[PDB]
Design a protein around this ligand. Structure first.
Ligand SMILES: *[C@@H]1O[C@H](CO)[C@@H](O)[C@H](O)[C@H]1NC(C)=O
Lengths: 130, 108
């Protein structure tokens, strides 16, 4: 399997943009245990900016950019023993873009039995007249 | 801040058994543990073991034994490895995220 991400994503300052991330192709028997979004160049307490659990849903441990400006676009947690969670589309959305949001974002899938599969995307924040 | 410790030792007088140990000191339960020899998991290292708290344990060569240990930690035994080899452990935990550290045999 592989992580499909764009090498670069461009968004307007103060606007909203999406960071695509997919675990392709669908493989029967491959279980996604966790999705982790990281800013690997931000300090240790600020790296883990978003995570998604198949049962408990999303979390945003780092205050920067924090939950106020981050959201999962299509990740759906499980709804009991009937419906299985859908974490293959780990696309992350940033709202109210600031110049502090420019840089590298990593999208990692903690998969069983394959392991950790990760891709990286650089977010470019476009400043008006700049 | 969450911390991952890694310890690799030769714990037998026969001097023919690498023992890899690593644990996660955090605020949440572990969703997955990935162990790799040579480098970071999924980023250059060769996958050695994948551990899930419910779906079981997955291991590759040359892992003779991979198992869970107490207090959010695991242990690993190699068959027979070099003294300068690095072993990396990555813990994926909700809600704090993923954390990884690496270790090696201490000098004699
Ligand atoms: C590691 O040690 C072995 C045996 O001492 C040696 O052959 C090898 O070159 C060493 N590797 C490095 C990167 O120094």
């Amino acid at each position: 399997v592989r992580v499909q991400v764009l090498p670069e994503v461009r968004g307007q300052l103060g606007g909203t943009v999406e960071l695509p991330c997919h675990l392709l192709p669908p493989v029967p028997g491959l279980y996604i245990s966790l999705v982790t979004w990281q800013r690997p160049d931000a300090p240790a307490n600020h790296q883990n900016v978003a995570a998604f659990h198949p049962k408990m849903g999303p979390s945003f441990p780092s205050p920067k950019p924090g939950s106020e400006r981050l959201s999962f676009v299509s990740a759906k947690q499980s709804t009991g023993q009937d419906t299985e969670a859908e974490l293959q589309d780990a696309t992350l959305a940033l709202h109210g873009l600031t110049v502090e949001d420019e840089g590298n974002y990593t999208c990692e899938f903690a998969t069983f039995p394959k392991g950790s599969v990760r891709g990286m995307t650089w977010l470019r924040v476009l400043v008006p007249r700049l | 801040t969450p911390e991952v410790w890694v310890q690799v030792r030769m714990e037998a007088t026969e001097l023919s058994s690498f023992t890899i140990r690593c644990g996660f000191l955090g605020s949440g339960s572990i969703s997955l543990v990935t162990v790799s020899w040579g480098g970071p998991n999924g980023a250059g290292g060769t996958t050695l073991a994948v551990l899930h708290p419910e779906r079981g344990i997955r291991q590759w060569a040359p892992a003779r034994q991979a198992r869970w240990e107490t207090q959010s930690s695991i242990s690993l035994i190699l068959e027979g490895p070099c003294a300068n080899t690095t072993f990396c452990c990555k813990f994926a935990s909700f809600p704090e995220g993923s954390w990884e550290a690496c270790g090696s045999l201490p000098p004699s």
